[PDB]
């Protein structure tokens, strides 16, 4: 079927009884312990079999296709805040379990009609690492990678994911990509030309001051000084998004 996600091809050839309806993707095995993770903002891994087959919860439509359809109409600010809040919830859950994505981009942010947004393809940044363009036929989007991975710094941390979630954030406000680079060196040049003037006034105009503060904190070039999902959830940007638990 339709599907081409980051590391393999996703579709639905079989099904198995009881109206299973899943997404099945073809591409150590500690990704089998990702089956034990449960969070409303994470696409649940149902099963995994090496012969390898991943079977994810089927959600069509991803944040990229939504932003593409919402290109001219834009996205309501409460919906942007809700998506960013849910993605930060998922990132905090994954980082508390020492699980990185290391290559977030809007194509692995699945959405449903209920309004929920879930992180997909997560924690498998070891099955052929993170994609890189070695051949001229390969594409590989670099628009959302943290500068430390772009350079080639070998030590990756949770701070990379935040950086990605930062870029996507700005994108949802402009449905124009923040750092649309076409090589590693051009990506670094764009990043450090933007960051080296930086309140994010001209680059994300429609975003209020709380939003620009949260964005600049999510887009610190230094990964050790980049904001965490925990601290970002406590940002005054989410003052009207936070609601008690019952």
């Amino acid at each position: 079927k339709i599907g081409e996600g980051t590391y393999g091809v996703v579709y639905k050839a079989r099904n198995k009884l009881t109206g299973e309806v899943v997404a099945l993707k073809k591409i150590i095995r500690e990704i089998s312990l990702l089956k034990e993770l449960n969070h409303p903002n994470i696409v649940k891994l149902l099963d995994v079999i090496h012969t390898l087959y991943l079977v994810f919860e089927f959600l069509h439509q991803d944040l990229k296709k939504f932003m593409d359809a919402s290109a001219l109409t834009g996205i309501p600010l409460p919906l942007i805040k809700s998506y960013l809040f849910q993605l930060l919830q998922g990132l905090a859950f994954c980082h508390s379990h020492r699980v990185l994505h290391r290559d977030l981009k809007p194509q692995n942010l699945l959405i449903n009609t209920e309004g929920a947004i879930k992180l997909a393809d997560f924690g498998l940044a070891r099955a052929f690492g993170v994609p890189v363009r070695t051949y001229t036929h390969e594409v590989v989007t670099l628009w959302y990678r943290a500068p430390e991975i772009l350079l080639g710094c070998k030590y990756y941390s949770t701070a990379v994911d935040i950086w990605s979630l930062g870029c996507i954030f700005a994108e949802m406000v402009t449905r124009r990509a923040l750092f649309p680079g076409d090589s590693e060196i051009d990506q670094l040049f764009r990043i450090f030309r933007t960051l080296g003037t930086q309140d994010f006034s001209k680059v994300v105009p429609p975003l209020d001051e709380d939003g620009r503060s949260l964005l600049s904190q999510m887009l610190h070039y230094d990964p050790n000084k980049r904001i965490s999902a925990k601290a970002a959830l406590a940002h005054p940007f989410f003052q009207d998004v936070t609601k008690p638990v019952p």
């Binding site: 439509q61 939504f66 359809a69 919402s70 109409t73 996205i75 309501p76 919906l79 959405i111 009609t113 309004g115």
Partner: peptide, 10 residues
């Protein structure tokens, strides 16, 4: 939610 309605019904 109206934005979602329109997008998913598209």
């Amino acid at each position: 939610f109206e934005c979602l309605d329109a997008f998913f019904s598209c």
